[PDB]
Paper text:
A 1.5-MDa RTX adhesin [MpAFP (Marinomonas primoryensis antifreeze protein)] with ice-binding activity was found on the surface of the Gram-negative bacterium, Marinomonas primoryensis, from Antarctica. MpAFP can be divided into five distinct Regions (RI–RV) that include the highly repetitive RII (Region II) and the moderately repetitive RIV (Region IV). RII consists of approximately 120 tandem copies of a perfect 104-aa repeat that account for over 90% of the mass of the 1.5-MDa protein. We hypothesized that MpAFP_RII serves as a Ca2+-dependent extender domain to project the ice-binding RIV away from other cell surface molecules in order to bind M. primoryensis to ice.
Numbering used by the authors: 2 to 416
């Protein structure tokens, strides 16, 4: 008889595992054959998934044969048999045996993209800066450290899946302002070298500006004029604010004589704020600015503007009293009758029709300034007989409503 040797089979591929790519092509199965009657040229036979493969032992005790990966994927064990002869021509089979494993599939998982910024809207501030785009990746062969790729506005951003299945990557807001749809692809692999991609989709919106409205300012006081009395107290400056993104509670800011005043737009599109007359007396124009924001948090100022007029003084004139009777003496027949006491009132804001008031002997006489700047009033002679000194006071006002008194004095004698 002939004598068997030793046959061995090397790993099936470098890791002894058949993956997808290997299973799809051809695999060199190799090994050794020596000892006994094994000689160069002895045929090596392998049956693998029912297919008979054959090669011959080379000159160094080695053999190799190309096997279809599909047969190795289907059959995880096989003998390799070398057939030999001794010189006498007895025959003998030497067997070596092989095992391997098969894994021809990686498993995708699940990938998601979170809202793009807290509100899934890119605003103006966000477009101008850096936004962190985040999400999840979990399931199947997705593991910590797998690559995440996002293409956004033609820019390729990458990160890696963290230990918790989340991922984040800093992205330019510009890019997000310009491209409102994209995918995150996560690429995973298994021990065997199989690879798989898992995709998640994201959309968002862009809104970079908030819309101004219309702001108006009412008259400054009833007549749009600041008088002295008004300048000395407080004035309610009011108006309206509506349209665009203006809403109740939006701040209204007015600067007037360098003082900053603020209130808030009420529920009816109206506003009001107490301003010191003195600032209004000092500064005859101002803007009222309402600061608003849209849903996305863009902000906008709406301006309305005010003018007004200022007049805080009346001007006193000149008042005189004529001689009391032609000779400036009250006689007995004058005392017994009525005397016309007369004079002038002119200058400043004194005007035709201004009130003239005389108190003589406790009795109050009044008349008005005529067209010529003179005045006269009939007075009891007895009163002039009883009181030899008195004032005439003329009360005048201006258009703004300031008022002034002008006084002239008189004395006379009695006989
Ligand atoms: Ca023999
Ligand atoms: Ca392999
Ligand atoms: Ca068979
Ligand atoms: Ca050969
Ligand atoms: Ca088998
Ligand atoms: Ca066997
Ligand atoms: Ca032989
Ligand atoms: Ca093996
Ligand atoms: Ca697998
Ligand atoms: Ca946002
Ligand atoms: Ca890309
Ligand atoms: Ca896109
Ligand atoms: Ca892996
Ligand atoms: Ca979204
Ligand atoms: Ca907007
Ligand atoms: Ca006024
Ligand atoms: Ca001003
Ligand atoms: Ca302005
Ligand atoms: Ca708002
Ligand atoms: Ca005005
Ligand atoms: Ca005046
Ligand atoms: Ca007289
Ligand atoms: Ca008197
Ligand atoms: Ca007047
Ligand atoms: Ca006199």
């Amino acid at each position: 008889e002939a004598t068997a040797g030793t046959v061995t089979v090397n790993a099936i591929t470098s890791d002894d595992v058949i993956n997808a790519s290997e299973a799809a092509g051809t695999v060199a199965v190799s090994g050794t054959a020596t000892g006994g009657d094994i000689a160069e040229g002895d045929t090596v036979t392998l049956e693998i998934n029912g297919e008979t493969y054959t090669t011959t032992v080379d000159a160094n005790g080695e053999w190799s044969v190309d096997v279809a990966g599909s047969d190795l994927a289907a059959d995880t064990a096989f003998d390799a048999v070398v057939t030999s002869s001794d010189a006498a021509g007895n025959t003998v089979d030497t067997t070596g045996s092989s095992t391997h494993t098969v894994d021809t599939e990686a498993t995708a998982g699940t990938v998601t993209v979170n809202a793009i910024t807290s509100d899934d809207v890119i605003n103006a501030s966000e477009a101008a800066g850096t936004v962190a785009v985040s999400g999840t990746a979990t399931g199947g062969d997705i593991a910590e450290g797998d690559t995440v790729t996002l293409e956004i506005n033609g820019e390729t951003y990458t990160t890696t899946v963290d230990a918790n299945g989340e991922w984040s990557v800093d992205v330019a807001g510009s890019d997000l302002a310009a491209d409102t749809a994209f995918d995150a692809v996560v690429t995973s692999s298994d021990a065997a070298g199989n690879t798989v991609d898992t995709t998640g989709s994201s959309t968002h919106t862009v809104d970079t500006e908030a819309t101004a409205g219309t702001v108006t300012v009412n008259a400054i006081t009833s007549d749009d004029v600041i008088n002295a009395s008004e300048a000395a107290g407080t004035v309610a400056v009011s108006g309206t604010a509506t349209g665009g993104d203006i809403a109740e509670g939006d701040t209204v800011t007015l600067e007037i004589n360098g003082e900053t005043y603020t209130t808030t737009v009420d529920a009816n599109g109206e506003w009001s704020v107490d301003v010191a007359g003195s600032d209004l007396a000092a500064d005859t124009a101002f803007d009222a600015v309402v600061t608003s924001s849209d849903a996305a948090g863009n902000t906008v100022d709406t301006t309305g503007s005010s003018t007004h007029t200022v007049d805080t003084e009346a001007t006193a004139g000149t008042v005189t009293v004529n001689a009391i009777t032609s000779d400036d003496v009250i006689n007995a027949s004058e005392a017994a009758g009525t005397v016309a006491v007369s004079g002038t009132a002119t200058g400043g804001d004194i005007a035709e029709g201004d009130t003239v008031t005389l108190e003589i002997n406790g009795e109050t006489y009044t008349t008005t300034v005529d067209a010529n700047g003179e005045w006269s009033v009939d007075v009891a002679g007895s009163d002039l007989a009883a009181d030899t000194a008195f004032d005439a006071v003329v009360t005048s006002s201006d258009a703004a409503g300031n008022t002034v008194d002008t006084t002239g004095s008189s004395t006379h004698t009695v006989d």
